[PDB]
Ligand binder design. Structure first.
Ligand SMILES: [Mg+2]
Ligand SMILES: [Mg+2]
Ligand SMILES: [Mg+2]
Ligand SMILES: [Mg+2]
Ligand SMILES: [Mg+2]
Ligand SMILES: [Mg+2]
Ligand SMILES: [Mg+2]
Ligand SMILES: [Mg+2]
Ligand SMILES: [Mg+2]
Ligand SMILES: [Mg+2]
Ligand SMILES: [Mg+2]
Ligand SMILES: [Mg+2]
Ligand SMILES: [Mg+2]
Ligand SMILES: [Mg+2]
Ligand SMILES: [Mg+2]
Ligand SMILES: [Mg+2]
Ligand SMILES: [Mg+2]
Ligand SMILES: [Mg+2]
Ligand SMILES: [Mg+2]
Ligand SMILES: [Mg+2]
Ligand SMILES: [Mg+2]
Ligand SMILES: [Mg+2]
Ligand SMILES: [Mg+2]
Ligand SMILES: [Mg+2]
Lengths: 251, 65, 54, 52, 230
RNA sequence: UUUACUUAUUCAAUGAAGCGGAGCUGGAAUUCAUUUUCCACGUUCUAGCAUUCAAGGUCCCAUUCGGGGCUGAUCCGGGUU
RNA sequence: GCUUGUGACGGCCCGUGAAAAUCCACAGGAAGGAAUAGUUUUCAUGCCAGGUCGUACUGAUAACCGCAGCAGGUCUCCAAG
RNA sequence: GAUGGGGAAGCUCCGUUUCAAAGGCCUGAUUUUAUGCAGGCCACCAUCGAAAGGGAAUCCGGUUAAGAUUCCGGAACCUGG
């Protein structure tokens, strides 16, 4: 055969991301002395739209503590913040929506977002619209905090990792149908070249493992092994179950 | 520690599967009873949601030079 | 803008060719009232400390 | 006492500035300099004599 | 006077711009400086075998000063003095025709490594000084055992550059006295008594101890707090 | 198998800026005879401002329109974290 | 009326529709300064200079490409009753 | 797409600010007197990439066999000094 499409996507020629209208990378402020010991105050100047991203962005400007200068950071907007608002960041910040606190300074049940996985990587977890992380316990010895992630899984983080109080704006986005191929076109136009999708059963055997034969079919089962060799991984990759997750078809 | 990897991966898959089943139940419960309601009920529920959804400066002295 | 005299690019006021005069008077009132609130804060902090001294 | 501990207000180390000598050769580069490669007779060649 | 007014600044944690401080602890040094400092650190962190760790037991300051006074009394001949000796003895042998007669027996220190290693094993040497800082250490790691086996007084002294200035080079890494004139034999005997009290009599005890396990400041403070908790 | 150590090896960030230990000053403490302990160690109603080795306070000056020190801004270890 | 420029509005988006050179202004208060003067060439008038390369014509049922003076192909502006 | 580095037997490959001692303005002081240090800076790292994107400043009348917002006549403007 020939090289198939999911193999072809890794050389990254026409499959790279479309990043022209994007505002910049959205990450937290760099951890330093002021956030490590006290707090610092900035002000949010504008809330803007970012191309290829469901959640809006916030432009929070702070002061440089070693030079007479201003520093502007790009945050992801939590639901409720507005222009002209003060944002406090650091160890001694108060528990208000929009503030940036370490995870060892929040009580149980607190709703945080844009959470660092390691202390100092400036935001990794719960960054899409409508998502959040729930604090579900602490460990004062061993300096660890237990969290629940948006997928349902549980994780244990160092208490020096930071997070922003609140839920990320833009929720309820997928509750609307698209209704139109043109709407899907204009959606993926600002992300990457991955739409439309031809089915593998509609190709020839040179192009795909599922291609060929009269009466379009997959000849064998579609569950692949985990140790397949990268031209074979087409289907359901390492599935532990199949079915409906609902068992009733109607609720 | 030879059990910790397989046990942590097992617990993580069970927690992910519970979350998946929960979100699927919630989305099917949203999509049905909405696609299965006529224009009358649709307009009524739309109308319902559109309906219900020390001066401090005193401690300061005066005529100060 | 390099070919004209300064009268065409300026208004005779503080922040003259830069701000609005509404934005300017808002800055003036904000500066004065914030500094007076800082004086109020220092006075009441002195009062709490001179109460707790006894 | 110890020796000499300079105070540094910058965390950056730049390359220091040393004395750059001027060039002073032992023999000449060309030993005969050229004449004017574009003088007046080389610039102006001839008039142009047509109707225009 | 009363037109000047005091106004102290709040260098705070969120109040004013910080002043210029001494940040010499946080300089990003060049890589050659970094490799020097970390080479010294890694040499002191590891366990060191006794045959290299017998170095860094050098001589004391007063004994080093007295030893270098004695050795400076026997400085080798320099180039102008050699040339004028050649002139004077050539003029003398032009008339009288005698060699090694106008020039007497010279006394100086001996300084090359092959030469001094051959003055030991013939046992002509009466004092050996070994530098502590030869950069391939394999050139001098055998000299204490050789001096001990052949019965020669030796001392491990600070400075191959100091030995070089003693013997008119930049570095020399060894020095030896073979003969003294007539009046320094008593001072040489007192010096070799003080030298053998420090180096050769302690050899069979020094050759069995390893040495070098030293931690840094933060690890030492951590171990102190852990043992105080213990 | 489990557990320690850090210098090899590995990962991440920065403008290699505030690390580690000991202090001062409070507070709780609460002395079982004391500081064996621990928290704190200048900024939170407001879309303002914050930059000239820093003013002040002491010392020498070469006193000229001035020029250098300490302190303001606790010591120590040079292990960037 | 027609073509075109422009202004104030309005509709649409799970689509919100480039960057850099460059120029100006403001905050700041360094430094210089009026008395026989300093600042102004951001007010007016007067003086001198502005290098290198392209520039004719066709743009198509004969000037381009299809072996051709080939019914094919090949981007755009103006537009009378 | 070089350099600093790192791969490859090698032709060469990666990468574009990187794990590099990566470079300029001027005040100096001014009087071997001309410009060594200056005493404060210095965060950015080469370069190439649009005759439809961005961009300092020109119009009218005449003139040839064939040229013109370029020549001639008149009238302007911009940059630099
Ligand atoms: Mg890309
Ligand atoms: Mg589909
Ligand atoms: Mg087919
Ligand atoms: Mg077929
Ligand atoms: Mg096949
Ligand atoms: Mg098939
Ligand atoms: Mg069948
Ligand atoms: Mg005006
Ligand atoms: Mg048109
Ligand atoms: Mg302007
Ligand atoms: Mg022409
Ligand atoms: Mg033409
Ligand atoms: Mg033409
Ligand atoms: Mg045409
Ligand atoms: Mg035509
Ligand atoms: Mg045609
Ligand atoms: Mg042709
Ligand atoms: Mg044709
Ligand atoms: Mg390349
Ligand atoms: Mg170019
Ligand atoms: Mg162009
Ligand atoms: Mg444009
Ligand atoms: Mg023509
Ligand atoms: Mg003309």
């Amino acid at each position: 055969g020939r090289v198939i499409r999911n193999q072809r996507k890794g050389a990254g020629s026409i499959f790279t991301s479309h990043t022209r209208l994007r505002q910049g990378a959205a990450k937290l402020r760099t951890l330093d002395y002021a956030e490590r010991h006290g707090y610092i105050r900035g002000i949010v100047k504008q809330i803007v739209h970012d191309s290829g991203r469901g959640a809006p962005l916030a432009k929070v400007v702070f002061r440089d503590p070693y030079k007479y200068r201003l520093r502007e950071e790009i945050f992801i907007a939590n639901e409720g913040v507005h222009t002209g608002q003060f944002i406090y960041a650091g160890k001694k910040a108060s528990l208000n929506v929009g503030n940036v606190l370490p995870l060892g300074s929040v009580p149980e049940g607190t709703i945080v977002s844009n959470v660092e996985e390691k202390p100092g990587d400036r935001g990794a977890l719960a960054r899409a619209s409508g998502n959040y992380v729930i604090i579900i316990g602490h460990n004062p010895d061993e300096n660890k905090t237990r969290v629940r992630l948006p997928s349902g899984a549980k994780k244990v983080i160092s208490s020096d990792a930071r997070g922003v109080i609140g839920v990320i704006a833009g929720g309820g986005r997928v509750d609307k149908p698209l209704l139109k191929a043109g709407r899907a076109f204009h959606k993926y136009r600002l992300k990457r070249n991955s739409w439309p999708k031809t089915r593998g059963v509609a190709m020839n055997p040179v192009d795909h493992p599922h291609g060929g034969g009269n009466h379009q079919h997959i000849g064998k089962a579609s569950t692949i092994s985990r140790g397949a060799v990268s031209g074979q991984k087409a289907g359901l990759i390492a599935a532990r179950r199949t079915g409906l997750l609902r068992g009733s078809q109607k609720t | 520690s030879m059990d910790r990897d397989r046990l942590v991966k097992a617990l993580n898959f069970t927690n992910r599967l519970d979350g998946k089943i929960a979100k699927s139940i919630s989305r099917a419960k949203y999509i049905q009873n909405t696609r299965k309601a006529g224009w009358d009920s649709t307009n009524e529920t739309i109308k319902k949601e559109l309906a219900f959804l020390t001066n401090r400066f005193g401690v300061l002295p005066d005529d100060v030079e | 803008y390099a070919t004209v005299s300064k009268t065409h690019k300026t208004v005779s006021r503080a922040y003259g060719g830069s701000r609005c005069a509404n934005c300017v008077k808002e800055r003036i009132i904000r500066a004065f009232l914030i500094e007076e609130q800082k004086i109020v804060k220092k006075v009441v902090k002195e009062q709490t400390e001179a109460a707790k001294k006894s | 006492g110890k020796k000499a501990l300079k105070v540094r207000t910058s965390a950056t180390f730049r390359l220091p500035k040393t004395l750059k000598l001027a060039r002073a050769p032992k023999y000449a580069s060309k030993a005969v300099p050229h004449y004017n490669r574009l003088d007046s007779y080389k610039v102006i060649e001839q008039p142009i004599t047509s109707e225009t | 006077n009363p037109l000047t007014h005091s106004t102290p600044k709040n260098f705070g944690i969120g109040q004013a711009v910080q002043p210029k401080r001494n940040l010499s602890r946080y300089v990003k040094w060049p890589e050659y400086v970094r490799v020097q400092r970390q080479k010294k650190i890694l040499s002191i962190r590891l366990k060191v075998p006794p045959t290299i760790a017998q170095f860094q037991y050098t001589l004391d300051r007063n004994t080093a000063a007295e030893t270098f006074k004695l050795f400076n009394k026997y400085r080798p001949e320099t180039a102008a003095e050699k040339k004028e000796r050649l002139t004077k003895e050539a003029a003398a042998v032009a008339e009288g025709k005698s060699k090694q007669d106008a020039s007497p027996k010279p006394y100086a220190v001996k300084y090359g490594l092959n030469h001094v290693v051959a003055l030991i094993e013939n046992k002509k040497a009466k004092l050996v000084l070994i530098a502590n800082d030869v950069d391939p250490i394999e050139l001098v790691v055998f000299l204490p055992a050789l001096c001990k086996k052949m019965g020669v007084p030796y001392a491990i002294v600070k400075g191959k550059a100091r030995l070089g200035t003693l013997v008119n080079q930049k570095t020399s890494a060894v020095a030896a006295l073979t003969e003294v004139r007539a009046e320094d034999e008593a001072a040489l005997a007192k010096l070799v008594s003080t030298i053998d009290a420090n180096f050769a009599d302690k050899y069979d005890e020094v050759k069995k101890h390893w040495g070098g396990g030293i931690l840094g400041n933060k690890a030492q403070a951590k171990m102190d707090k852990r043992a105080k908790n213990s």
